[PDB]
Structures are given as C-alpha cells and as structure tokens.
Amino acid sequence: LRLGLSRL
Amino acid sequence: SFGPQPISRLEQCGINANDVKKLEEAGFHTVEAVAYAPKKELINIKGISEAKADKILAEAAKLVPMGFTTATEFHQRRSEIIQITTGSKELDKLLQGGIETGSITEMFGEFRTGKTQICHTLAVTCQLPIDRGGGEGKAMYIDTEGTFRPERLLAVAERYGLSGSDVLDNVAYARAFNTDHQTQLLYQASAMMVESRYALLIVDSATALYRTDYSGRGELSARQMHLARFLRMLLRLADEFGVAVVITNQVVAQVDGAAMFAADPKKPIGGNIIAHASTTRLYLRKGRGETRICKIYDSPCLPEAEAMFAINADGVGDAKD
Amino acid sequence: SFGPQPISRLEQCGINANDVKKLEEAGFHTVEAVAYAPKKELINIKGISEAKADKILAEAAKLVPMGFTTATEFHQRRSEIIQITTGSKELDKLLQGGIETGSITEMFGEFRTGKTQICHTLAVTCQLPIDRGGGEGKAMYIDTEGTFRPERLLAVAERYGLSGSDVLDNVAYARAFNTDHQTQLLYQASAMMVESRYALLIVDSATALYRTDYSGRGELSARQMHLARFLRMLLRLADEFGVAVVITNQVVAQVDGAAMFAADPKKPIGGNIIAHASTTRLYLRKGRGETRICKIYDSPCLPEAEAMFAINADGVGDAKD
Amino acid sequence: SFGPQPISRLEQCGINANDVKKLEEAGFHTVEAVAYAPKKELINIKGISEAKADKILAEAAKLVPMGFTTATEFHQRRSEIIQITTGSKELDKLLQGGIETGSITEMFGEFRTGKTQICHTLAVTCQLPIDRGGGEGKAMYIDTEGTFRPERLLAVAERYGLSGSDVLDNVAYARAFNTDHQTQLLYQASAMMVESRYALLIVDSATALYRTDYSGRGELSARQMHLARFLRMLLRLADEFGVAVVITNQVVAQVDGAAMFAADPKKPIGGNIIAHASTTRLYLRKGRGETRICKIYDSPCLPEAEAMFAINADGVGDAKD
Amino acid sequence: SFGPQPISRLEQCGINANDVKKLEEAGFHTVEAVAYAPKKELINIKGISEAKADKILAEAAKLVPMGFTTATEFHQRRSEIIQITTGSKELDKLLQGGIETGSITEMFGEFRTGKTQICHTLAVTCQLPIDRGGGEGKAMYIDTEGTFRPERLLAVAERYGLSGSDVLDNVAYARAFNTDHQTQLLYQASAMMVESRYALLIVDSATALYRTDYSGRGELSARQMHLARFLRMLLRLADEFGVAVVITNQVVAQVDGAAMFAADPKKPIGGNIIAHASTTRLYLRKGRGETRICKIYDSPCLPEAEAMFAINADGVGDAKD
Amino acid sequence: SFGPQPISRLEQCGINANDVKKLEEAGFHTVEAVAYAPKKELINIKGISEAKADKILAEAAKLVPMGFTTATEFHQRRSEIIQITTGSKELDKLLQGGIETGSITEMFGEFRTGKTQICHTLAVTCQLPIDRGGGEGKAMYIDTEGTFRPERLLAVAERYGLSGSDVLDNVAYARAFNTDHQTQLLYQASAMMVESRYALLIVDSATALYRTDYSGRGELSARQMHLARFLRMLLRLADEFGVAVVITNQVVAQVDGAAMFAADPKKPIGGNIIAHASTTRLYLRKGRGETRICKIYDSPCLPEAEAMFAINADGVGDAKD
Amino acid sequence: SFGPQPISRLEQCGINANDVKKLEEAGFHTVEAVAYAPKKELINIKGISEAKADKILAEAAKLVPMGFTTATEFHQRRSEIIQITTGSKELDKLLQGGIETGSITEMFGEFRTGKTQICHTLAVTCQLPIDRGGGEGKAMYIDTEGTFRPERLLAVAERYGLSGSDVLDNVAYARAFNTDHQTQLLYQASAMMVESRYALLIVDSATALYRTDYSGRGELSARQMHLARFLRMLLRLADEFGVAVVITNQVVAQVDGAADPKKPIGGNIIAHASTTRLYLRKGRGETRICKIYDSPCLPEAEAMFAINADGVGDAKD
Amino acid sequence: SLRLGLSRLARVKPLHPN
Amino acid sequence: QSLRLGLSRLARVKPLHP
Amino acid sequence: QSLRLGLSRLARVKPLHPN
Amino acid sequence: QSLRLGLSRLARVKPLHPNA
Amino acid sequence: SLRLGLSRLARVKPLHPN
DNA sequence: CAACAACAACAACAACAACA
Ligand SMILES: [K+]
Ligand SMILES: [K+]
Ligand SMILES: [K+]
Ligand SMILES: [K+]
Ligand SMILES: [K+]
C-alpha cells in the first residue's frame, strides 16, 4: 500500500 | 525500498532496453507510472505495438500491487502519514497536524491575504526533521507570477535555527511563462525528483496563466480541458513519490448575483474541475492589522472551523498578544 | 550581452527571412519574446504552420535556458537589481532601495496625492549613473490624461545638476486617446525599446480611460479582459527588457458599506485583475500643507509601514522641518 | 493648416460619401474626431460594418500623428500655447499667464463668490488680440441656471475699448433645461465650431442639474456615469478644437467628515469623477466688501497659493487698495 | 401668440389622446413642460414606453426651439422684461425697476422685518397696468404660516385707486399644512396658470415647515433633497409661464464660527441648496421706528447696496420724513 | 356642524377599525389631524404600512378640502372670527376687538408685569356669551410655575356677574413638571378637547422649564428642537379646533449685543424659533403704581402702538383716571 | 398617608433592588421625585439604559396622578393649605394668614433690617400646633454667614411657653462654605426630609456666596446657570415634601442712568423663580416696614412690625 | 369650505344661562 | 389619587410638643 | 421661433382693471 | 505632421475686431 | 543563467557626460 | 457549464447683570 510518505 | 522503484528494474523481466529508453523519453520514469497508466496512452506512444504494451502492462501489474485490501491495514498505513507544520500552533490545531503528504491542498483568497508567505514558510519548514515537523525532504517552487523571495526563506530559517546557505541549496526554483511551459516543468520535475528525496511541491499560482491564455467563452471549454490535464499530472505525482502538492488560487466577484449579500462576496476561479480535483481547500481572509483568518472550505475529514494566524517578520506565526 | 538578443539570431538557425519578417510584423522583435510566447499565439499568426511553429519554438528554447535553477543562484542574481531612487530618503528607506526593475509598481490615491509628481521625478532620476542611485537609461511616458509637464522635468534636472536639453531629449512621450491606442503604444514601445536602452516605463493613468470606454454593467467582462491583456503585455515587456514598470491608479468611493477607516473610505478601481497583476502597491494620501503620506498596501517582501514625503519646486523630496 | 481637418478630406481617401454623411450625422465632423474614437463607437453607428469601420480608422490614422515623440518637441509646442487674461493682474500672476487653452479649468465655491462674473469677463476678453491677452475668437455660453446677463458684457467691452454691439454679436448662448439637453448641446457646439473659430467654451454650471435630476443613493451610479460621459465629451472638444473649456461647480457641507472642524468645511460636489477629470481647480472664497480670494486647489504644474481679486462695475479686476 | 402652447397641440402632431391624458394627469399641461422634461421623467409615467416617450420628446422639440442663439437677441428680449414695482421709489431704484419676472427672489431677515408686507403689496401692484409698473395679471399666495390678511390688500388697493372687490377677486390663496402639501399645491397651480394670466407667485414661507417636519441629524439629507425638488419645481414653473416667483425665508443664529461678532450675527436657513437655487437675494433689517433697510445679499447683475423703506397704513412705501 | 369631524368617520370609508384605533393611540382623534399629518408621520406608527397610509391620506383629502380658493372667501371667513375681550377698553381698542382665535398670542415682559393676571381674566372672559365679547366655551390652563389661583377667577366672575361655581367647573387645570410632561399634556388636551367645546388654551409659561432642563451651550440644539416641536403641536391644535392659544414668555437682560442701552434693556427668550412661531406678540411694561403698558411687538396687521391698563381686585381693567 | 411614598414602593411593581440603590445614590428618595424627573436625568445615571429608564418612568407614572383636573378640585385642595404665622398680627393680615407651604417666599432689604430675626421666629413657630398657627414639624437652617444664634430661639420659645430643650433639639443646622456645598447640603437635606416630618426650610442667604465665588462679566453665565439649578432643586424639594421654603436675598445699588435706589440681586433668574417677594425697610426708631414686592394673589400693601427681645412682633405705641 | 377659527354666527348652546 | 398642594391642616399629625 | 424669458412688456394684454 | 497643444500664438489669424 | 532585470554590474556607457 | 465591480450626499442652534 502506497499512501505517500511514512514516518517509519 | 519505501520510495518508488525506478524504471531501471524491469529490464531483467524480459523487457528490451530500447523500449525502456523510449518510455523514459516519453515521460515515464518509474514502474509506478507504467502500472498506473491507461493502455490507450501507452498505445498512442510511438514505437510500441499492442503486444509489447500488453506484455509490459501485465508484468508492471505483477510488480506493483493493485487490488483490494483490508480497511484495518489502510487505517494503520494512514496513521503513518507525515504532516508538515505551518509554523503556527493555531493553524496546526485547525489542520490536525499540518499539510498532509501525498495530497493536494488549494488555498484561495483575495490579495495580500498571505498565500505566498505560507508557501515560503512551508518550503523552508519541509527541510526540518520529521519529529520537529518536517519531512527530511527538499522543496520545489514552480512560480508563475514572479513573487519568489529568498529573503523570507532566510528569515524563517534564522527563526528555526538553520544555516541560510544550506537551507537555500535545497530549494529548487523555476518560473513558468505560459501553460505549455507549466506542463513541461512538471515533465522535468518528475525526472528531477526521481533521483532525489523531495517532500514538497508548490505551484503559485496554477490558474494565473489560464486567466489570460484563454479569454472569452469561445475558448473556455478547451481552457478547462488543459487545466484538467495539468491537475491529472499533479495527481500522478501525489501517487508517485508521496510529495504534498500546495496550490494557491485567485478569486473573482459575484457581480451577476449576490446570495443574500455577503459583504463583497468572492468566489474562486477555475470552475468545478479544480474544486473536484483538490483534496483540501482553505479560504484566507483579512482581519485587523497583520492578523488573518483561515477557514476550511472543503475537506472529507475535518469540520468547517476557523483559525487566526499572522504574518510577522519571521513568517507565518500565531497572533501576537 | 546582458541585454536580450535580437530576433535576427534565429536567422543563424535556418529559419527563412519570411518567417522572421512575419514574426516582427506581429510584434515579436526578440527571441526571448518568441520563447515566452505560447504555441497558440504562433498558430494565430498568419503564414506559419504547425511544423514551422514547432521548429521556431524549439530553436528559441535552445537559445534561452528555461530549466530548473537553485535558490542560491536566484538570491545571487536578485542582489544585483538596479533600484531607482524616488528623490526622498524616507521613501527609499521604506522601499529598501527604491523602485525595483523587472517588476510592477502601482500607486493609487485621491487627487492631489502626487502620483504625477513622483512619475516626473522617477522619469528624470532614471537617467542618473548607477552609483548615484539612478538607472543609466532613458525614460518612457504614456499619458492618458494630458497632464505631462516638461517644466517639472527641467526643475528636477536642474536640482540634480543635469543639463535640461539632453534630459528632455532622453524622455520619450506619448498620449493615448482610447484603449486601442493605449495597446498599440505598447507594440510601438517594444519596437523602439529593442533599438535603444530604456530603464523606466510609466503609465498614468493605466485605468483612466477604462472608466468611460466601458460604461455599464453589461460591458464589465470585456473591460476586464482588455485590462488583463494590457497588464499581460506590460508584464511581457518587463520580463523581456527588465525595465521598471510603474502604473498609476484612480480611486472610487465605498458607499455600499462605508468601511471602518474614516468618513471617506476609498478603494482603487480595476478590481481583482489589477489587484493580482501588480507586484508592489503604494497608497498615497494628503497630510497637511505640502506633505503627503505613502503606505505599503501590498508587497511580497516589504512589511506594512508608512513614510512621509513632500512636493517642492524641485520635485518630490523630504519634508523641510 | 493649424486647424483641424474637416471630414470631407476622407472623400479624397477612398470612403463612400454616404458613409461620410452617416458619420457626420453621428457627430464626427472632423478627421481628428473619428481618429480619436474607439472602434466600438464606429461599430455602434447603424449602416457601418466591421470592415468599413476598420478601413475608416486606418485611413484616418494615416492622416494624424498618433505615435511617439521626444519631450523637447512637447515642451516647444507647449511654449506656444495661448493663455487668456482673466482681467485681474493678481490672478494672472497666480496662474502665470491666465486660463490655459486646450485643458479643463474648474472653479468652485459658495454663493456670491464670483464664478459667473469670471465667466462673463473671460467671455468678453477672449475676443481681444493675442498681444492684449485674448485669443481673437468667439465665445460659447451653455447656461444651466438662467443667470446670463448681457449687460456685464457691455460694461467689460466698454472698459476694454471694444464695441458693445460686436461683442454681443460674437457670443453664442444656449440654455440647458435638463441633463439630456445639456449633453445634446455639445453636438451642435462641435458642428458649429468646425465652421468658425472659437477660443472659449463655458459651462455654468456643470453639476447644477445633476443634484435634482438624479436624487438619492439608488441613482448614484447612473448619475456618475452620465457625468463621466459629459466630461469625456468636453475633453474631446478641448483636444479636437484647442478651445479653453471652463466649467463651474457647486459646494456641499462636510457634516462630520474630517477638516478638523474649521469655521465651515465645504467640498465640491461631483465626486472623484469630476475630481480626476478637471485639469485645474480653483477655490473661491468671499473676503471683505467686494474683494474675494482665489486659491489653486489642484494643478499639475502650479504650486498652491492665493490671490486677491475684486468684482468692480466693469467686471473682474484688482481690488482698489 | 406669446403665451405657452397647450398640450392638445401634441394631438395634431400624430400622438394619441390616451397618452396625452396620461401626461396631463402626470402634471404636464403644456408642450413647453414636456420639452423641458428628461426622458427618465416621461418613462416613469405608467402606460408610457421608451418608444412612445422618444416620439413624444421628438415631436415636442419641434414646436419649441432649444438650441444656440446669439447674445444680441438675448439682450433684445431681456430689454422687454416686465418689472413689478414694490411700492417704494428707493426700492425700485435699488432693484433697477422692481421685482423681475421669470426669476426667483428670496427675501430673508429677522422677525417683523416686513417680508409679508412686501408680499401683500406686490399682490396688489402686480395687477396694475404695464405703464404704471404692474404686470396686468392675477396673483397667487401659498401661505404656510397662517398670516394672510386681505385687509392690507384692501388698503393698498385704496392707495392705488383700484376697486377693492376687483382686487380681491384676482388673488388665489392656498394654505400648506405640511411639506408634502406644499409640493402638491404646485401641480394645481401649474394646471391653473394655463387657463388664465398670472404674473406673481408667492411662497411665504418656503422653509417654515421644513424646520419641524425634518428634525435633527439623520433626516438632513432627505430634508435637503425634498427642498431641492421643491425649488426645482418652482424654477420650472417660472421658466414655463414667465411668472415672478417670490419666496420668503427665515434666519438662524450663528452660535459658533464668529462671522464678525458685530451685533448678533444671523444666517439664512436652507443651506447651499436654497443658496444656489435663488436668483436674487434680499436681506431685510429693522431700523428706527417703522423704517426698515433692504440690502442686496446676492444678485448676478446688481451691486451691493442698501435702501430704506417704511411700512405705512397703505402698505410698503417710502419713509415719511 | 362647524366643528371637526371625529376619526370615527374614516371607519365607514374602507379603513378597518383596528387602523383607526392605532391612529387614536398615536394621538390623532380627528380626520383633520390625519389629513394635516405628513406621510412619514403615519409611517412611524407601528402596524401601518405604506399602502394603508396612502389610503388613509386619500380618504382624508377627499373628506377635507385643501385646494385653491379666492381671497374674497378668506375675507368673508376672517370677518366672522371670534375675538375675546381682555377686560379693558383700551386693550380691546389696541387689539381691534381682542384676542384672536385660531392664532398664537404671546405676551412677554419682566416679572410683576401681569401676564398671569391677564391669563386669569382671559380664562374667565372666554366663557361669556358672544354678545358680551366671550367665546361661549370652556378654558384650559397648563401651568408650569405653580402660580394658578382660582381666587382671581372668582373675583372676575363676581365682577362679570356669573356664578362662581359655573366659572370654576368649566376650567381644566394641569401642572407640567418637565418638558416631556408638558408635551404629553398637549396630547391629553387634544383627547379631551375632541369631545367637549373649548374656546381658549393657556400655556404659562411656555419657556420656564427650558431655562433649567437644557442648561449650557452643548444642549442648545436639542432645546431648540424640542421647543419647535412643542410650538408646532400647539399650532396644530389651533388649526384643528379653532381655539385661542395664549402663551406667556420671560425675558433676558441684554449685555453686549445691543451697544445702545436704555436704563435696563431686555429681550424675550426662546430665540428665533419662538420669534417666528408666534403670530401676535405683546410686550408688557410696568407703569406708575398699578398701571401697566402693553405694546404691539409683532403683528401681521396691527400697527405698533401702546395702551394702558391696570390690575384691580377684579382682575385686568381700565385705570382709574 | 398623605405624604410622599418611599422609593421602596418601586420594589413592589417590578424593579430590581440594584436599580433602587442607584436611584437612591443619585438623590431620588421618593416615587414623586422619580416621577417629576425627565428622561435626561435618568439616562445620565451610570448603569441605567434607555429601556430601563422608560420602564421606571412608566411604572412611576401610575402611582401618582399626572393629568387634568377641574379648578374646583384645585380650589378645594388650596382651601386647606397650612400657613405659618410670622409672629406679628399686622404681618399676618398683610400676608392673609402668613407664609404658605409649598411655594417659595423670599425677603430682601438692606442691613440691620430683620430678615434673620424673621427667619428665627419662623423656625421657632413652625413647631406650634395647627390651632395656634404652626405646622407641627421640625425646622432646618442652612446658614451662609455664621449668624445663627440659638439665644433668639430660646427667647421666642420662652415667649410662646414651649420648652427650650426640645425646641433646640427639633432644629437641624448646617453651614455652607462654598457654592457647591449649598447643593450638597440640599442633597443631604432630601435624605433628611424623607425619613421624618419636616415643615420649614430656611436659606439665609441664598445669594451671599455667589457674589464672591463668581466675579467679573466672564463668569456671569455660569453663575446664573448654577443659581437657576439651585433654585430648581429648592422648588423640587418644595413640591415633593410640601415644605415652606424661605430664602433671604440682599440688595444692590442702582448706580445706572436713573431710578428707591436699591434692587434685589440675582437678576431675572431669581426674580422669576420666587412665588412671593417681600421688601423690608427701616422705619423711624426701631420699627420696620414690610411691603409685598411681588405676589400672584396679594395686592401691593405695607405693614409695620417690630423686633423685640422676644423676636418679631407687633410694634407697641 | 374654509375654516379659520370659531365662527361668530355658529349656533351653540348657552354655557352660562343665568 | 389626589393632587398634593403642600401641607394639609386636615391631615392627622402626631403632637410634636405634648 | 424666438426664445422666452418672462412676460413681455409689448404684449397685447387685455385690460384687467378698466378704471 | 506634429502634435497640437491648443491654440498657438504663432499661428496667423485675421483680426476679429478692428484696430485698437 | 537567469536575468531578473537590469544588472547592477553591467558595463554601459553613461547616458550623461557628467 | 464560467466569467466580471461600480458609486457620495447633507446643516443646525442663543444665553447672561452689575456696582456708590
Ligand atoms: K498583488
Ligand atoms: K485633477
Ligand atoms: K444665487
Ligand atoms: K411673528
Ligand atoms: K414671581
């Protein structure tokens, strides 16, 4: 799933 | 490998490098674009037949997942969305964290409201570490009016405690003189930001050039079509690198008819295409002195609430008591 | 070769003389103007096909770079911008150098404020050497009201120690009787600017004739479109040659709401088109005697403040205590 | 060939005589008039198509100079302007020659200040030779108040040594009963000005009928538009024929707005329209006995000052010290 | 054939009878009244369209000349104006003939000065033969204070050797109870002047009811607009029928803004509206005993001077030495 | 049926009883009051719209004649008015019959002159039959000083032979404690006067409470406006019911506005408002012993003269020679 | 219950206690005082709005009649007006009963005349029973000259047989040092009057301090306005509490063009605000003469009185 | 018709018969 | 509900001096 | 046609007062 | 072929009035 | 390189000979 | 299914005596 930039 | 896989890793999947270079010069720079591309535009390209298009589309769909997923996993992933702080506590509270990455935020209002100041503050803030509000990323400024000032970036960087030269070396700048240049800027920006970590894209303003490039009813329809194309490209970027796209918009009067009067009513220009295309919408109004009021106009997750901020010598901040 | 290259350079790229002749006839006297022009304008031009327009655009884009830069380079290039003194120390302190070149400065206010006096002072100070705060170039004056007085030019030239005859010779003057004449004067101004070297372009008043030429509610849209075209042409000239564009604006009464400022609230005419077109905006008002007050209404990099100047027999200057 | 060119010149230019007659009936009695007119005005005339209007405009522009020129030429031309003596030495010194031809001069003040007296004196003196401060031309008097007395004219003519019968013979008089008649009279004014030589046009007073014909806040916009059209017609006459246009205004009391509560604040009526249209403005105040004070309210080349004049039995003159 | 043309003549011009009846009901009882009215005034009439109003105006403009004429003709026509003697030789000398027909004379002063006595004397002296200084016609008296006494009329008739009953039969008196009735009486007055010959119309007093009907701030604008409309209707009557209009005005005390502090300074009420509307202004003061003094406050063709009169048992006359 | 028509006549004309009741609460108890009121006075009544007010005014104008009438009818009506004798032969000869009805007579002077004695004598004498010089009606007394004494009424009634009980029972008495109560007493007076027959109303003194309620220059305008309203309402009552309104006034010592002084110069108070409102003015002065002198200060028809009267045990009478 | 009703009655018809407290602080202690005041004074009180003042006035107007009544009722009301004896039979005949309550009586003359003696006699005699000619109430003495002597009161009390102790106790005394102190004393006097039966109020003199506190032509208007306000406050007190107010006035010489070359001071402001005016003159020996200078119901006449060791009384032959 | 004050010939009942 | 003109003799009053 | 200002002195006016 | 700025004192004009 | 107007370091002959 | 703001007016109000 590619929902954008991730903190982790 | 959280970032998109570049277009360099399908040649081992039985794809001739010549087709890869043709796709690269056509505008496709990652497998994400190919897997998310309709077949009709891959057929309209020059040098690719139907069989080759099918054989590349099937493998691209094989590499990139495309199907149904559980809502719990979607919520867990959305819990990990980076939100860029605007430098104001009230604005942060109103936006519930800040500007969402991988999303389109359009802000509109009359002149001197402070859209360019907000854009400059966001551009300088995007370079902060994640835990402080930033996204470890650079910034890009596609400006169509001619109101880019490095001095404001220097001032806000000094406020946040950063080197002026270092914070300036991360911001890419480009000016568009017409709509075709505006589209070619995105075409070049894809290849610019595939190789580097970018976390903010700013267009100020998208609709300024369309107001004069196409004038009158006779050229209206074509106008809209072009705008739609531009917006679609923006959406692709939002799904290709997760950058947050920020757009500023202009307003016009309601001369034809005032809805029960609204103290000089104003409506954003662009039509319904950008109203439907944008995800978050903000309305900026002038108050007393340097204080301005920001109101949510349309958002699928936030209530319509107002907040008060100000534009000081260090950028966008809270109201000074 | 800091100045723009002439259109004849395209002759070296293989384009025949007929194409260059038609391009010059339509109003493209410079390769930069051709590059900044969209394909639609070239297609509209009689005698050029799709392939010819594409070749011309490609050659123009090859000649002039239209790519992505770095904010450090922008800061370096902006720091070397010539600013023309306005004849007053307080005004220069408020403007942080004076009238900027390559941008649009608008001045508005009630009658007797001193817009024409500042225009005369700027037109006579643009010929000073750069070390003295001038622009080292000729002045251009377009008048739509019939209030151009060379005696003021002579007075300020005598104040600054210049010779009257050559100062008068270095100022070009034209009068526009209607809006179409006003627009044709822009093409003529571009044609003559290609040859000589100018630094200032003054329009006074920019919107004086639009009040009468387009009277009524039914002609509002056409008036706004014509004003938008005029402002876009001014922006094109400023981008092409770098001269500082200064336009004056009239005022109208706010009888509908009476505002909150005072018993005589006034707002500039022209609407959102001129509100968004201009870069810097100055509001002039009368003080006491021969003293006037200037306020920064809107500026991308100047904080809100006020300055207090005066008009004497030697032009616009500082108040005598 | 200093005077304007009659429209019949277009007959030897390639224009149909019937179309020339239609233009003349529409109010264009001179090549300058059609040249200065916009394309919309020629389109509005019945029987004139777009191609005919474009050809007429091109042919007319071929016969008049509507381009760029140096400032020294403008200075040389303005040094030869004709200024009409008011009859008072102090007023002549204040205005540096007197009333200037080709522009608009307006006087305003309360009652009995002496506006009609100045109008009568100027009407008499405009027929003097150039060496005596006149213009060697006839006079026009459009009167909207019914206060035309052809006995002051005889007194001034006796003072200046001219024949009273000839002075009365060489003055044209008309009365305006409403705003529509007032604006209509200008067409006949131009039609009969193209034949003979006139030097002065007088409207006394311009805004008397607008107070009553358009009453209330709901009729403000229409009144201001009509006033703007009238002032534009006056400016067109002044540019076409070079006559000196003089208009008379009235005053209203500032009930609460500004003026710092002086003895009795008073401001001219007409608003920003008449404030911006007039080139020179004079404020008349009552002094002691038969003496009055004139002050330069607004002028692009004359400093603010004051002068003292008187209304003697032979018109406007100097106070008997 | 020196009188006005009845509206029925418009029937012979090719105009229906229904719209003629509508015009007559609207208050236009003469072709001159229709010709002097603006287009918007005829449009406001119910049952009249734009085409009908245009046709009516075009046909009315043919029967009455409204154009340009020489000043010698105006002088010849003004040399034949009937002037009504006021009953005193000194007043006749001061006014150079007496009260002038076709204009408005406003007489103001303190209480008991004698303006009502002057009106009563004029109402009798206007019925004299022309060679005796009269006007050979009836008289009108619109009294808004309740101070109409026919005994003074009888005394003046006895002085001049005219039958008392015949003098009384030729005076039409009406009383106004409020401002609306004051304006309503003028319509019936205009309808009644058509069938007979009237030489004098007296309003006493014009602004008595306005002091009380509109009280305080917030009603000043409406009061002044109503007063202006009333004065314009009076002027239209004077121009239409060539009657002598005399109006009586009151005074107020100048509390602030010391004029000269001579002895109890007083200012006429009504403001700039009535200041500009009236053509001649007379200031009446009390002298010693029965002698009073009249001064020319404002006149376009009369010097400032003073005359002495007295109020004897036979009306206004010369002081008995 | 010479009296006024009660407001219960409009109900049988197309007006609902609710509107009549609302008008009655507004203080209009007679068709004449409704007819005399302007439209804006009826608009201010709650629950009455523009259409209702127009219908009511049209009905009232239909019932009450307010047109143009000749002077002979006015003379006939003026020869039949009732004049009330003051009790003294010399005063009756001076006033040519006595106090007039339908007008306002104001007596002013210093203290002890005998204004209250004259008022008491008039109150008694107004009840006499027409042959004896009375008005045959009741009397009203609004007293603002506490100086009302029925003993003088009894003495004068004894002198005239009338029974004391009948004289006392026909005198209505009210005491005014401030200005607002003074005005409300007039509404109550109209309400109680519509039913019975009254011939004389007394205000003593009109301007006593204004000297103390509105003290200072800052409260002068409101005081004058309230006094004007009070006097206008009194005049409305006089025109309504034909009563004789008699008011008393005080004096103030001139200090500097005269420059020519007798032993002690005094002028009436109330200013121009009361100077203009009053129809007849009498000045009372103290003679030798019990004798006093009355002078005609202001009268539209009475020549200025002086008469001598006295104050005896039976009220105002002739001096004993 | 013929006297004024306390302001607390306004509590019973729909007014909060706080409004009553603010009205009391402003100087209004009875319903009649509120009724007699216009809207301007009620608006001027801080904290009171337009609607609240309108409600207060409408509520107070119903508790006291404010309309039209026939002259018979006024005559029958005036027929039982209490009049206080002056102490001299001749002066009682001259005044037709003596000093009347509810109006303003002013006495003026030269020095060594006896105005203060008459004031002392009135202060003593206002406590007599109604049969003897008193008012059966206490007395107040506002003094602006320091000439208040209780020994005269004791002498007159001994003459009439009343006890000295309760006569002295039933007299309130106050001294005014400046012009504003007079109005402050009146404001205090209102609160003293509301809570007890008071019959006579004395001001001696009502114009002494105005001569010295206000000087020159430039201060004439302010002095006249302040005097008018003071006189109106006195009239309001007299109308509200039904007391007999006696004020004392001095004389000024007539040095002007021509002419007794003595006239009362204060001008038209005090001339028009006095119901009864008495002019006192010094006669032969000790006896003095009194004349009715101005009165709305009494004719011009002269009487003779004398001041003895026991106060004002008839002149023995 | 007209109306100025109280008409002298208007019939009215006697207020005081006596 | 009458008009108070001052101090009334008929009004009952306590004896100030018994 | 000529213009008009007021009542003309030379107009043909019928006698209002025969005496 | 040049601009006009009103009536010019250098232009020829016949005498409107006779000599004086 | 980009151009943002009149460069301050340009080598241009002076307009006025002073 | 889009785009486009314009326009100011109106003055009113007098009060206060004093000093041989
Ligand atoms: K802007
Ligand atoms: K101007
Ligand atoms: K005038
Ligand atoms: K009067
Ligand atoms: K009195």
Numbering used by the authors:
A (entry chain L): 332 to 339
B (entry chain K), C (entry chain I), D (entry chain G), E (entry chain E), F (entry chain C): 19 to 339
G (entry chain A): 19 to 277, 282 to 339
H (entry chain D), L (entry chain J): 331 to 348
I (entry chain B): 330 to 347
J (entry chain F): 330 to 348
K (entry chain H): 330 to 349
Give sentences copied directly from the paper behind this entry.
The central protein in HR is the RAD51 recombinase. RAD51 forms a nucleoprotein filament with single-stranded DNA (ssDNA) generated from enzymatic end resection at the DSB site. One emergent RAD51 modulator is RAD51AP1 (RAD51 associated protein 1), a protein that directly binds to RAD51 (15) and promotes its activities in HR, thus contributing to the maintenance of genome stability. Our studies reveal that RAD51AP1 acts as a RAD51 modulator via strengthening protomer–protomer interactions, promoting RAD51 oligomerization and reordering its DNA binding sites, thereby facilitating filament nucleation, stabilization, and strand exchange.
